[PDB]
Amino acid sequence: YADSFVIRGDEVRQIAPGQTGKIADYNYKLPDDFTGCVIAWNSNNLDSKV
Amino acid sequence: FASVYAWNRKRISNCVADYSVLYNSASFSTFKCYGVSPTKLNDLCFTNVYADSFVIRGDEVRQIAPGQTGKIADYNYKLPDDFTGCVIAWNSNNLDSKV
């Protein structure tokens, strides 16, 4: 399974098992026994507009 | 792009320049002209246009201004006090920075 989205800078910490915040408990929730991997990278050039 | 201590310089003449495509595309963070009104650039006729290109840190864009002091202005690139023209600066984090 591959899931994709876009978040803010500080929110990459919230994408982890046993996490609390706003996105973690309202938009995307990870099971505690999750197995797999998570990849994140910057896209300020492309996804940001003046 | 070239480094600041060897800033690249080009001269352009005998050309028909469309300055609209520069002004409309607002992706440039800093768009500051000094001697002229930026919106009027498509109405004046010139010769011997000079374009200097380089890459610098984010902090030092404020040092690219007439009558400025610091470390890069007085060692690498000094502007004349009576300079006339314009300065363009925009972000290049995607390709010019590596993990």
Comma- or semicolon-separated keywords:
part of a larger assembly; 2 chains; 50 residues; mainly alpha; 0% strand; globular; viral protein; SARS-CoV-2; Spike protein; Spike glycoprotein
Please give a structural write-up.
The structure is cut from a larger assembly and holds two copies of chain A. Chain A has 50 residues and is an all-alpha fold. Chain A is 16% helix and 0% strand. The radius of gyration of chain A is 12 Å and the shape is globular. The termini of chain A are far apart. The A-B interface holds A 42, 44-46, 49-50 and B 26-29, 91-95. Chain B: Disulfide bonds join 33-86. Chain B: This is Spike protein S1.
Estimate the global geometry of chain A from the Cα principal axes.
globular
Biggest contact: A-B, 6 and 9 residues
- First-residue to last-residue Cα separation of chain A: 34 Å
**How many helices of chain A does DSSP assign?**
2
Q: What is the chains' assembly state?
A: part of a larger assembly
**Which bin fits the share of residues in helices of chain A?**
10-25%
Class from helix and strand fractions of chain A: mainly alpha
Order of helices and strands of chain A: HH
Number of strands of chain A: 0
CA-atom Rg of chain A in angstroms: 12 Å
Strand % of chain A is under 5%
Biggest sheet overview of chain A: none
PDB class: viral protein
Keywords: SARS-CoV-2, Spike protein, viral protein
Entry title: Cryo-EM structure of SARS-CoV-2 S-Kappa variant (B.1.617.1), dimer of S trimer conformation 2
Chains A, B: Spike glycoprotein
